[PDB]
């Protein structure tokens, strides 16, 4: 089964049909003013009218600034691109800082391309090539469900010969793409020799021919990459692709102009449709002043995704300015370009509900006395520390032979693992021995 991650308990914004926030829903609690506002951002992103418009989630550590941003991704669902990045990823050693911003701005715009999947597979019963020489190759296929003959393009037959295919092999043909694979020799030929260097596979029990609608997701960044450098052009089967190492590169401005011009042509022909997604920048304050001054252009641009930023700093110095202080660690002239959402500190009565939601997600039964006690730890410390005690306390409860948390299991962990406050007190009282 799936692993329980830090945000695996949140399933959406959980707003009611009027747009108001419920007190507790979809794994979130409290936070009404902030999460009601994120509803308006989901309505904005789903409306597709806008480019480059941006939002800043601001407030103390442990208050929901990652939780709400991932809750937006759950409200959008897998059909809409959501690119997460950390502001600290901008410091590449192969490309300039502004390029790492531009690549991530291009990961957040998606094409949505529809095509029919068309698979033929089976034992090959015959091959017959038919300028007069090879117009096509007829190929015969067999499975336990029946037979077909197919008329192959000479480029597909060149691929059959690439795979060293012969009659009596079991083949997968992907007719919409020209992919070809040998699965193995058909086991009706498994006695052609007693010991030979081929692997034999049973005659496929599946249909000779299979259809699906499939929907392909591709970002503008995948186009910007795959068309910029000369391709490897070499499907392993080569050796020049061993010599020149692949590396990241400062992809030109002009090429993106042509990708935009080709994508415009295809969305007009209805072969593709567009989903402007979100770029989510964790730790935005970790961007350099040079990067912030690139966003003074990137957020204006008529193609750009919606951008969501997170920060938890006070009136600190702006990274790389030497001495300029500005709120949230973001330059005032960028801060004047974002809608700001404030994020509140939880009351203990909210924290107890988060602890319960985490416990029932994490798979832990907890007695009401111990859940009250983790609520008391929520008064002493922070939400993250109290949440982090659950699995540790469950393991001591399990070793002590019970399938539920009780007081002495959580009181043991509270003595055994310190928080930042208590350990900082222990450092200050021995400051001359570290």
């Amino acid at each position: 089964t799936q692993r329980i991650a830090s945000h695996s308990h949140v399933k959406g914004l959980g707003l009611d049909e009027s747009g108001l926030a419920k007190q507790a829903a979809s794994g979130l609690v409290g936070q009404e003013n902030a999460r009601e506002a994120c509803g308006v951002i989901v309505e904005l992103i789903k409306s597709k009218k806008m480019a480059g418009r941006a939002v800043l989630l601001a407030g103390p550590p442990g208050t929901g600034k990652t939780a709400l941003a991932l809750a937006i991704a759950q409200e959008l669902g897998s059909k809409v691109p959501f690119c997460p990045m950390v502001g600290s990823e901008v410091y590449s050693t192969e490309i300039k800082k502004t390029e790492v911003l531009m690549e991530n701005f291009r990961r957040a715009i998606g094409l949505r391309i529809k095509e029919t999947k068309e698979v033929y597979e089976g034992e090959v019963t015959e091959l017959t090539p038919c300028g007069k020489t090879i117009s096509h190759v007829i190929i015969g296929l067999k499975t336990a469900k029946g037979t077909k003959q197919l008329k192959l393009d000479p480029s597909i037959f060149e691929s059959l010969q690439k795979e060293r295919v012969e009659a009596g092999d079991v083949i997968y043909i992907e007719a919409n793409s020209g992919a070809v694979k040998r699965q193995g020799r058909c086991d009706t030929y498994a006695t052609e020799f007693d010991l030979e260097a081929e692997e034999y596979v049973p005659l496929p029990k599946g249909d000779v021919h299979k259809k699906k609608e499939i929907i392909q997701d591709v970002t503008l960044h995948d186009l910007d990459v795959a068309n910029a450098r000369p391709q490897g052009g070499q499907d392993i089967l080569s050796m020049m692709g061993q010599l020149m190492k692949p590396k990241k590169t400062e992809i030109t401005d002009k090429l993106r102009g042509e990708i935009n011009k080709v994508v415009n042509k295809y969305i007009d022909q209805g072969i593709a449709e567009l989903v402007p997604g979100v770029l989510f920048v964790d730790e935005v304050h970790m961007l350099d002043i040079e990067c912030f001054t690139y966003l003074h252009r990137a957020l204006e641009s008529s193609i750009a995704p919606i951008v969501i930023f997170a920060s938890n700093r006070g009136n600190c110095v702006i990274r790389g300015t030497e001495d300029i202080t500005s709120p949230h660690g973001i330059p005032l002239d960028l801060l004047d370009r974002v809608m700001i959402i404030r994020t509140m500190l939880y009351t203990p009565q909210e924290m107890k509900q988060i602890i319960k939601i985490r416990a029932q997600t994490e798979g832990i039964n907890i007695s009401e006395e111990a859940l009250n006690h983790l609520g008391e730890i929520g008064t002493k410390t922070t939400l993250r520390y109290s949440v982090q005690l659950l699995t540790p306390a469950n393991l001591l409860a399990k070793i002590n032979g019970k399938d539920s948390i009780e007081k002495e299991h959580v009181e043991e962990i509270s003595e055994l693992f310190y928080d930042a406050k208590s350990s900082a007190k222990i450092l200050a009282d021995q400051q001359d021995k570290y």
Partner: protein, 49 residues
């Protein structure tokens, strides 16, 4: 004693030196990873676009 003093090839001949030659194990790739696990293969229908 005279042999070495006369020419050291009478005692030991200078050997034909060559670098030390070595091979590791071949790096074993699983059949499952080889069938389902390269983006060059499992994504080829997308890569066409």
């Amino acid at each position: 004693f005279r042999k070495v003093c006369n020419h050291p090839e009478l005692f030991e001949r200078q050997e034909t030196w060559s670098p030390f030659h070595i091979s590791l194990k071949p790096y074993h790739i699983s059949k499952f990873i080889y069938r389902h696990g390269q983006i060059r293969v499992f994504n080829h229908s997308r890569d066409r676009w």
